[PDB]
Amino acid sequence: RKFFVIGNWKMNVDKNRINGIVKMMNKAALDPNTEAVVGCPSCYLSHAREHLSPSIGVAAQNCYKVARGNFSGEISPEMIKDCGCDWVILGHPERRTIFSEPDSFIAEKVAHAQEAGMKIIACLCETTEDRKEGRTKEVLFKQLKSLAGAIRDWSRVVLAFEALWASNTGVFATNQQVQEALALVRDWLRNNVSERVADTTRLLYAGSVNSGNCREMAALKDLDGFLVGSAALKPDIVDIINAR
Amino acid sequence: RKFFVIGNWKMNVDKNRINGIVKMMNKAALDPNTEAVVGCPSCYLSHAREHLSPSIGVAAQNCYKVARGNFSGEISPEMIKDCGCDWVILGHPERRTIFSEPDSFIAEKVAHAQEAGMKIIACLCETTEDRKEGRTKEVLFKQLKSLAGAIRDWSRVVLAFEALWASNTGVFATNQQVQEALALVRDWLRNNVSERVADTTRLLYAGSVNSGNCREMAALKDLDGFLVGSAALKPDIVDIINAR
Amino acid sequence: RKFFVIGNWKMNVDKNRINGIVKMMNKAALDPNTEAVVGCPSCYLSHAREHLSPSIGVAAQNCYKVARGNFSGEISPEMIKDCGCDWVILGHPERRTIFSEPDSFIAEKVAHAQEAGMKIIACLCETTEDRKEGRTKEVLFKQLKSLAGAIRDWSRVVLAFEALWASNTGVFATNQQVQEALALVRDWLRNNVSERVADTTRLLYAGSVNSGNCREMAALKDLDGFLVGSAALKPDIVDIINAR
Amino acid sequence: RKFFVIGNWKMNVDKNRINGIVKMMNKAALDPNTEAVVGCPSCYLSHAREHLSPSIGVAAQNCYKVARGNFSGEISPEMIKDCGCDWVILGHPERRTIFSEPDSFIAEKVAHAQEAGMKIIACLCETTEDRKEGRTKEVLFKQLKSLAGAIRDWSRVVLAFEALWASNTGVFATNQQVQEALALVRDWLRNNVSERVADTTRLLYAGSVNSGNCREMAALKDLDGFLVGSAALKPDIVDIINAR
Ligand SMILES: [Cl-]
Ligand SMILES: [Cl-]
Ligand SMILES: [Cl-]
Ligand SMILES: [Cl-]
Ligand SMILES: [Cl-]
Ligand SMILES: [Cl-]
Ligand SMILES: [Mg+2]
């Protein structure tokens, strides 16, 4: 499983900031054995893709569930590809919570993105309430069951897990908690899809990884890389790419 | 009130289709007394702005309610301006219905778009159900009260009204019912904001307007222009801009 | 209403026969006051369009209701446009009878072809059984009601009426029966859509029309042209185009 | 039995997408021991055949049951051959389900395509309601008996089996389920046609095959190749052709 790092710029960049990040990533010595991608706002996809090293992917942060139509404010996988970009993040925790996107909606998006030839970073997450009530496994099973019902080509999927109780709360997940969550996800794939898919699907930890903790975290069992928010905007992203 | 036409491309264009529309609009003999704008998918804002005559505006089809932050899949007025575009459509009926955007959410967007210096096409709509339950006044007044609370500079706002019951139900809106809906909005502004605002604010009809019915609708008493979808992709958009 | 003649080649041509027909139509003296179109098999659309005079349109004989997807054997309006063609025939009596296409199916096709910017020849028909049971008004009203629910841009629609009891039966419709049916359709548009649409929409007679009866039928009050089958394969199509 | 791969583009391509797929397939190092075909929309048959290496066949995705006639929207094997294409897919599960094509209709098409000298990819399928109830043998034998009655020249036929219950419920058929079904089909040929026909007829699996599982599935007993949809639009089609 090739080490995989995606830096999600969320709604935190403009053209000037992207130019600086892209120049930094273009100039740095990057581990050739890491597959690196950046998550870019829809309005900057073409700009980012034209300037960034072609070996680094560019992902839209969301898309809709059909190729065309009367859906003001939405973009399709077909339009992302038209901007030169191969990747899309689907089911991001911010869409699931702030925008209340249901699992069935995300599944419709994943299914169409797959038909369009996209590569997908599909996100899983558990809330503070989920973890306190002991529903971690229940929520992950439900989210995975929904995703797997929409996926026909697992080779073009990467999965990311975020513990929302560890995002700007004053608490981080322990190494054991991270390893146990990703081991649960891999065992789900093994038992409900196939051993081949379990053994080849990259599982990411989405959390507060940075220069100071990435090498430690990159050695965790069942971890294949990272989905990073704030470190994507900083030199830390180079160290994370280089964590192995 | 300066005649105003916005052609909304929705999710129906790619870069090649935009290139054809933009060439057509750049080359067309457009009435200098019409203010013309196109509604453009977020991923093509910069492309459209860079290729479209500067005298024609470019509108994003949606935006979020703050300038920046951890909002995957959203863009801000500040980012739209960073793409060189001055306009944003807010409260479009497709967002109100398909995406269930409540008035209070649209209000937050309109307020921050006002703060950011955007020009806004703020949309009103009456559903088929609203028409049959006889609550047209009730729903339109609630929508307007919400918008007006979020607007302190009406010079940068245009209002658009869609009768959702007038598209693909078998029932067609007469010129009389269009004029009457627009006069209702205008008098609400007279009663609840100011007569100066009512006299100066452009009120648009959003509906099935094309080369065949546009000259007749452009002469309705309280109509100041059009928000059009399908015709925006056809040569009709020039005839609509030139409807007077 | 500009005189309109469409020659439908149905499934009666190969490349060689198309070359013969196209050569004949290209060289013939055609009335410039007539809008001429040919109905062409899907596999020959590009060939017909690249060889036919730019003055004469090319129409596919059918299409599906979405732009793309997992629909083996179907083509979309977007693919027809990609072949350089502007027109599609929808609801042809052969598809309503042999292929049992229901009104609601044809309505989805018309609505999507409209969204895609096609020009449409939408067909109505009464069967021998309908006429025998005195249900002529009933079936035409039902078909019209369905089509009207799907049309937003009447400027891009032509309607054609076929009396199937006049097709390879040994009975022809009289000129009086044709005028009565077309006047029925035009008054339905007056009553249920608008006077302006009734005034401007071309109504065609689909039936056995050839050199010997085209001038007489072309003088019928509510007839605006012809949807021709067998004469489209013969020099007669030139006389029909020139019937006024 | 020569390994056989058909990549069905369904209704998912335009001329641009074909040109990229065709250049990729043209430039690839393809196993000369694989017979490769692509399934092409009717309106692009000539375009695909004219741009594709002669080593790769081109199949229409459907046709009608006679050579010519008053059948708007239909094409014949004779017309497909006139476009230079040798193959036709008949009985595709999308035609059997979405378009409700009955076995008797499919047999009329197969018999006429045989008369016309076509090569045929004839499809079988088991729906969700079929795997449940357990009618695997009975409905498949109905489809097979119908195809066999319409075939006098098996050298020009390939059979494809789709477990529609898999794709439609979002799961994958096991390798034992695939081998069981193809062994079932071949044993039916052995007992009801001839040993020589069972021994020489290529049986394909129609399902979600991609670069990750194609080598595994290509080694399955009684499997002679693949009918693939989504992977035909991706570089995976090269890996599938080369899976042996
Ligand atoms: Cl990319
Ligand atoms: Cl993130
Ligand atoms: Cl602008
Ligand atoms: Cl609109
Ligand atoms: Cl044309
Ligand atoms: Cl009347
Ligand atoms: Mg008053």
Eight-state DSSP code of residue B218:
T
Q: How many residues does chain B have?
A: 244
- The residues near B31 (Cβ < 8 Å, ≥ 6 apart) are B3, B241, B242, B244
Using DSSP's 3-state secondary structure scheme, residue D210 falls into coil
- The residues near D230 (Cβ < 8 Å, ≥ 6 apart) are A114, A115, A117, A152, A153, D208, D210
End-to-end CA distance of chain A: 13
Place of tokens 């009389």: B176
Tokens of B107: 């209000």
Q: CB-based burial of residue A121 (10 Å sphere; 0-12 exposed, 13-18 middle, 19+ buried)?
A: buried
Q: How far is CA C214 from CA C58, C206, C219, in A?
A: 22, 12, 9
- Read off the amino acid at residue C194: S
Using DSSP's 3-state secondary structure scheme, residue B19 falls into helix
What's the CA gap between D71 and D62, in Å, rounded?
Answer: 14
Q: Report the Cα A69 to chain-centroid distance in Å.
A: 27
What's the CA gap between C198 and C201, in Å, rounded?
Answer: 6
What residues pair up with D59 in beta bridges, in sequence order? D39, D87
Q: Report the Cα C194 to chain-centroid distance in Å.
A: 22
What's the CA gap between D154 and C145, in Å, rounded?
Answer: 50
Q: What is the CA radius of gyration of chain B?
A: 17
Eight-state DSSP code of residue D242:
T
Tokens of D227: 């009918």
Contact across the interface for C72 and D14, Cβ inside 8 Å: no
Alpha-helix residue ranges (DSSP H) falling in chain B: 15-27, 45-51, 77-82, 93-97, 103-115, 128-132, 136-149, 175-192, 195-200, 214-217, 236-241
What's the CA gap between D206 and D125, in Å, rounded?
Answer: 9
What residues pair up with A58 in beta bridges, in sequence order? A38
Closest CA to A68 of B142, D65, C79: C79
Q: How many residues does chain D have?
A: 244
Eight-state DSSP code of residue B114:
H
Among B12, B170, B208, beta carbon nearest to C153: B208
Tokens of C58: 């090319």
Place of tokens 């790419």: A241
Residue pair B70/B50 in contact by the 8 Å Cβ criterion: no
Contact across the interface for C79 and D229, Cβ inside 8 Å: no
| Cα dihedral A152, A156, A158, A159 in deg (nearest 10) | -10
Q: How far is CA B216 from CA A3, B115, B173, C198, in A?
A: 63, 37, 13, 16
- Read off the amino acid at residue D67: A
Q: For chain B, give every domain's residue range.
A: 4-241
Binding-site residues of A for Mg(2+): 191
- The residues near C62 (Cβ < 8 Å, ≥ 6 apart) are C42, C75, C88, C89, C90, C92, C95, D72, D73
| Other CB atoms within 10 Å distance of the CB of residue D46 | 20
User: What technique solved it?
Assistant: X-ray
What's the CA gap between A137 and C129, in Å, rounded?
Answer: 64
Catalytic annotation, residues of B? 92, 162
Pick the CATH number of C4-241 from 1.10.1740.10, 3.20.20.70, 3.30.710.10, 3.10.20.600: 3.20.20.70
Closest CA to C78 of C39, C40, C117: C117
Q: What percentage of chain B's residues is helix, strand, coil (to nearest 5)?
A: 45, 20, 35
What's the CA gap between C78 and C86, in Å, rounded?
Answer: 10
Phi and psi at A225, nearest 5°, equal 150, -160
What's the CA gap between B176 and B191, in Å, rounded?
Answer: 22
Closest CA to D242 of D21, D9, D29: D29
Using DSSP's 3-state secondary structure scheme, residue B222 falls into coil
Secondary structure in 3-state letters for chain A: CCEEEEEECCECCCHHHHHHHHHHHHHCCCCCCEEEEEEECHHHHHHHHHHCCCCCEEEECCCCCCCCECCCCCCCHHHHHHCCCCEEEECCHHHHHCCCCCHHHHHHHHHHHHHCCCEEEEEEEECHHHHHCCCHHHHHHHHHHHHHCCCCCHHHEEEEEEEHHHCCCCCCCCHHHHHHHHHHHHHHHHHHCCHHHHHHCCEEEECCCCCCCHHHHHCCCCCCEEEECHHHHCCHHHHHHCCC
Place of tokens 């649409």: C197
Cα dihedral sign for D19, D25, D26, D27? positive
Residue pair A163/A126 in contact by the 8 Å Cβ criterion: yes
Using DSSP's 3-state secondary structure scheme, residue B93 falls into helix
What's the CA gap between C242 and D13, in Å, rounded?
Answer: 40
- Buried b / exposed e over B148-177, threshold 16 CB at 10 Å, is bebbeebeebbbbbbbbbbbbeebbbebee
Pick the CATH number of A3-241 from 3.30.2290.10, 3.20.20.70, 1.10.150.20, 2.60.120.10: 3.20.20.70
**Chain C adjacent subunits, 3+ CB pairs under 8 A:** A, B, D
- Judged by its nearest atom, the ligand closest to the C-alpha of residue B50 is 3
Tokens of A224: 């294949």
What's the CA gap between D101 and D107, in Å, rounded?
Answer: 10
Q: What is the CA radius of gyration of chain C?
A: 17
| Other CB atoms within 10 Å distance of the CB of residue B137 | 12
Tokens of A67: 């190729």
What's the CA gap between D59 and D80, in Å, rounded?
Answer: 8
Residue pair D94/D106 in contact by the 8 Å Cβ criterion: no
Phi and psi at C89, nearest 5°, equal -90, 130
What's the CA gap between D142 and D129, in Å, rounded?
Answer: 16
What's the CA gap between A44 and D101, in Å, rounded?
Answer: 47
Q: How far is CA B66 from CA B40, B96, B105, D1, in A?
A: 20, 19, 12, 64
Closest CA to B85 of B128, B126, B117: B117
Place of tokens 């892209």: A22
Q: Under an 8 Å CB criterion, which residues of A touch D? A: 114-115, 117, 148-155, 193-194, 196, 200
What residues pair up with C37 in beta bridges, in sequence order? C6, C57
What's the CA gap between C107 and C102, in Å, rounded?
Answer: 9
Using DSSP's 3-state secondary structure scheme, residue D204 falls into strand
- Buried b / exposed e over A197-208, threshold 16 CB at 10 Å, is bbeebbbbbbbb
**Chain A adjacent subunits, 3+ CB pairs under 8 A:** B, C, D
Residue pair C160/C206 in contact by the 8 Å Cβ criterion: yes
Q: How many CA atoms lie within 13 A of C193 on its CB side?
A: 30
In which region does residue C127 sit, left (phi positive, over 0), alpha (psi from -120 to 50) or beta (all else)? Answer: beta
Residue pair A123/A93 in contact by the 8 Å Cβ criterion: yes
Resolution for this PDB entry, in angstroms: 1.7
Among C12, C66, C80, beta carbon nearest to D43: C80
What residues pair up with B225 in beta bridges, in sequence order? B4, B204
Residue pair C204/C243 in contact by the 8 Å Cβ criterion: no
In which region does residue B173 sit, left (phi positive, over 0), alpha (psi from -120 to 50) or beta (all else)? Answer: beta
How many angstroms separate the alpha carbon of residue C206 from the centre of ligand 5?
20
B209 neighbourhood in chain C, CB within 8 Å: none
What's the CA gap between A141 and D24, in Å, rounded?
Answer: 39
C10 neighbourhood in chain D, CB within 8 Å: 69-72
What's the CA gap between C10 and D103, in Å, rounded?
Answer: 25
Tokens of A127: 């809330």
- Buried b / exposed e over C40-54, threshold 16 CB at 10 Å, is bbbbbbbbbbebbee
Q: How many residues does chain A have?
A: 244
Closest-approach residue (CA) in chain D for C61: D73
Strand-strand pairing, A34-40 and A3-8: parallel
Q: Which residues surround ligand 7, an ion (CB under 5 A)?
A: B 191
C61 neighbourhood in chain D, CB within 8 Å: 72-73
Secondary structure in 3-state letters for chain C: CCCEEEEECCECCCHHHHHHHHHHHHHCCCCCCCEEEEEECHHHHHHHHHHCCCCCEEEECCCCCCCCECCCCCCCHHHHHHCCCCEEEECCHHHHHCCCCCHHHHHHHHHHHHHCCCEEEEEEEECHHHHHCCCHHHHHHHHHHHHHCCCCCHHHEEEEEEEHHHCCCCCCCCHHHHHHHHHHHHHHHHHHCCHHHHHHCCEEEECCCCCCCHHHHHCCCCCCEEEECHHHHCCHHHHHHCCC
What's the CA gap between C206 and C172, in Å, rounded?
Answer: 12
Q: Report the Cα D85 to chain-centroid distance in Å.
A: 15
Alpha-helix residue ranges (DSSP H) falling in chain D: 15-27, 45-51, 77-82, 93-97, 103-115, 128-131, 136-149, 164-169, 175-192, 195-200, 214-218, 236-241
Closest CA to B229 of C109, C110, C86, C117: C117
| Other CB atoms within 10 Å distance of the CB of residue A71 | 21
What's the CA gap between B135 and B99, in Å, rounded?
Answer: 22
Q: CB-based burial of residue A219 (10 Å sphere; 0-12 exposed, 13-18 middle, 19+ buried)?
A: exposed
What's the CA gap between A114 and A77, in Å, rounded?
Answer: 9
- The residues near B232 (Cβ < 8 Å, ≥ 6 apart) are B7, B8, B9, B21, B38, B39
Residue pair B45/A43 in contact by the 8 Å Cβ criterion: yes
- Buried b / exposed e over C16-37, threshold 16 CB at 10 Å, is eebeebbeebeeeebeeebbbb
Tally C-beta pairs within 8 A across B and C: 38
- Read off the amino acid at residue B12: N
Cα dihedral sign for D60, D61, D66, D69? negative
What's the CA gap between D108 and D112, in Å, rounded?
Answer: 6
What's the CA gap between D86 and D52, in Å, rounded?
Answer: 13
Tokens of C135: 């249900």
What's the CA gap between A13 and B69, in Å, rounded?
Answer: 9
- Judged by its nearest atom, the ligand closest to the C-alpha of residue C57 is 5
Shortest distance between the Cα of D234 and any Cα of chain A, in A, equals: 7
Residue pair D82/C15 in contact by the 8 Å Cβ criterion: yes
What's the CA gap between B90 and B76, in Å, rounded?
Answer: 12
What's the CA gap between C225 and B238, in Å, rounded?
Answer: 29
Residue pair A106/A160 in contact by the 8 Å Cβ criterion: no
- Judged by its nearest atom, the ligand closest to the C-alpha of residue B195 is 7
C101 neighbourhood in chain D, CB within 8 Å: none
Among A117, A150, A154, beta carbon nearest to D233: A117
Residue pair C60/C78 in contact by the 8 Å Cβ criterion: no
Binding-site residues of B for Mg(2+): 191
